[PDB]
């Protein structure tokens, strides 16, 4: 009886040196992630529309470019919603499937239903289009050293289809698409063959990005057991910008402050922290002010602080694979 699903645990981080940190600095282009992963998700994605149909097809052609091996699944399910029943499709993008171990960064790619309102368009920017356009730069930015993968341990990105509510907020209008996938992964032996291990207990840590993209965010610590992941985003935040590597930056203004939040925050991590899978909860406290307003929209996002993260999130990410 393999004590494998315990490794995580104990798993370390293989932390990059100067030279190293300055070379993902480097690496990562916020005004390409900006015209080709950003600005094509700035769209109506509801789910079902034909928003959410040509999100997912940019989101999957975007992946299917990269040299790495990406594995694209798109998870389509139905449910019950305060409109009837209705079809929404996960998108799941895997580096080495058999694997028993994976790193999962996620997000959620629809966007709230709102009936246009003096022809106004909701398109949520930081809710969550830019946690999408991260995720895809960092794909791209870490292509080369992602493609080395080709420690039982691998990378996994999870786009979440009808996070938000039709209505208003309610347990049985809201995370669809997660509460549908956390369920379908812990009914899934893994690695293939497995006796009696699951999907969820080979997600080693779920990196839910949501509400980025505003000015001044600050991510609380809300977990004990990813606390310590926390310390290393905020480590790595100190290091990058002791090197000179953040733009517009201080150390009062940081965006990993020492400091927890009792509270639950609805959200996607939900259905898997109620498995037991260890979440660090990507989300700041408080929310952007434009929070579920027209104005969530690209004129409102602070380009230098999603420069910052994305620079942030890929050395946590090449830290926690040993890449
Ligand atoms: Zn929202």
């Not at 040196?17 to 282009?29: D, F, K, P």
């Not at 935040?237 to 020492?258: A, I, T, V, W």
């Not at 890929?314 to 040993?322: R, T």
Request: glycine share 4%; with cysteine; hydrophobic share 40%.
């Amino acid at each position: 009886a393999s004590a494998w699903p315990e490794e995580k645990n104990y798993h370390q981080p293989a932390i990059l040196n100067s030279s190293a940190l300055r070379q993902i600095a480097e690496g990562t282009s916020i005004s390409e992630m900006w015209q080709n992963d950003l600005q094509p998700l700035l769209i109506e994605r509801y789910p079902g529309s034909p928003g959410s149909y040509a999100a997912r097809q940019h989101i999957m052609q975007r992946i299917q470019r990269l040299q790495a091996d990406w594995v694209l699944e798109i998870d389509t399910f139905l449910s019950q919603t305060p409109y009837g029943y209705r079809s929404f499709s996960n998108i799941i993008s895997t580096l080495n499937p058999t694997a028993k171990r994976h790193l999962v960064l996620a997000c959620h790619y629809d966007s709230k239903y709102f009936s246009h309102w003096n022809n106004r368009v909701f398109v949520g920017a930081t809710d969550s289009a830019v946690p999408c356009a991260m995720m895809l730069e960092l794909a791209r930015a870490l292509d080369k050293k992602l493609l080395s993968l080709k420690p039982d341990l691998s990378l996994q990105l999870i786009f979440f289809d009808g996070q938000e509510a039709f209505l208003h907020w309610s347990p049985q209008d809201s995370l669809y698409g997660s509460r549908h996938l956390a369920a379908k992964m812990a009914s899934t032996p893994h690695p293939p063959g497995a006796r009696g291990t699951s999907q969820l207990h080979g997600m080693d840590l779920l990196v839910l990005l949501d509400l980025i993209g505003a000015p001044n965010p600050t991510f609380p610590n809300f977990f004990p057991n990813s606390a310590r992941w926390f310390e290393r985003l905020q480590a790595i935040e100190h290091e990058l910008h002791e090197l000179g590597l953040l733009k517009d930056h201080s150390l009062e203004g940081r965006y990993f402050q020492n400091y927890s939040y009792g509270g639950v925050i609805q959200d996607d991590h939900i259905p898997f922290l109620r498995r037991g899978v260890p979440v660090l909860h990507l989300i700041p406290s408080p929310f952007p002010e434009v929070w579920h307003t027209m104005d969530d929209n690209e004129e409102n996002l602070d380009e230098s602080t999603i420069d910052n993260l994305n620079k942030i999130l890929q050395v946590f990410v090449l830290e926690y694979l040993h890449l």
